[PDB]
């Protein structure tokens with residue numbers, strides 16, 4: 216019963232969710248904040 | 261739900277991606293385009309050259325017709341596997357692959 220509290224939340228989040236559409240499709244522009252952590256700069260061919 | 265969700269769920273119900281548009285009516289006219297990015301090295305010992313392109317195809321499908329205020333449904337690659345795409349292959353390609361990252 217301990218895991219059902221988060222299982223119900225995760226099932227409610229994807230209930231009716233359409234993954235084909237970006238968020239704010241009809242009202243705004245989806246802004247994506249990105250950064251890069253280079254773990255190792257490999258050899259240059 | 262919403263506007264684009266019900267439009268896509270109404271387009272894709274009763275849809276067979278196995279059958280091309282106008283299967284028993286007329287040939288499907290496909291307008292192709294291409295945008296070369298960087299023709300790579302021309303290998304002479306192995307007799308091939310590498311090319312990187314943006315291969316684009318355009319056709320008509322009467323089953324993918326919707327009447328709403330939305331003009332264009334700009335979709336990602338997730339909707340490719342649900343609709344019909346012509347089996348365009350390159351007749352002189354020794355090896356080729358699309359790009360799958362990210």
Ligand SMILES: *[C@@H]1O[C@H](CO)[C@@H](O[C@@H]2O[C@H](CO)[C@@H](O[C@@H]3O[C@H](CO[C@H]4O[C@H](CO[C@H]5O[C@H](CO)[C@@H](O)[C@H](O)[C@@H]5O)[C@@H](O)[C@H](O[C@H]5O[C@H](CO)[C@@H](O)[C@H](O)[C@@H]5O)[C@@H]4O)[C@@H](O)[C@H](O[C@H]4O[C@H](CO)[C@@H](O)[C@H](O)[C@@H]4O[C@H]4O[C@H](CO)[C@@H](O)[C@H](O)[C@@H]4O)[C@@H]3O)[C@H](O)[C@H]2NC(C)=O)[C@H](O)[C@H]1NC(C)=O
Pocket residue numbers: 337338339340341342356357358360
């Ligand atoms: C014989 O056996 C081999 C091995 O089992 C069979 O080959 C395999 O075939 C299956 C089925 O087609 C493939 O599954 C699909 O793979 C693609 C991605 O393919 C890319 O990644 C492959 C994995 O890469 C591994 O290895 C490399 C090595 O460098 C690593 O770097 C990677 O990290 C991985 O560890 C890679 O192998 C592919 O390259 C090969 O294939 C290409 C084809 O174009 C050739 O050019 C290459 O030379 C090479 O041979 C390639 O880079 C996935 O995208 C597929 O998932 C989608 O499609 C599924 C089916 O529709 C669907 O269920 C999924 O949800 C998913 O759908 C999504 O994407 C679709 C794309 O349009 C959308 O339409 C859709 O809506 C949705 O968004 C799937 O997982 C195997 O990868 C492939 N593996 C190999 C090794 O070739 C072979 O078929 C068998 N032969 C026979 C005749 O039985």
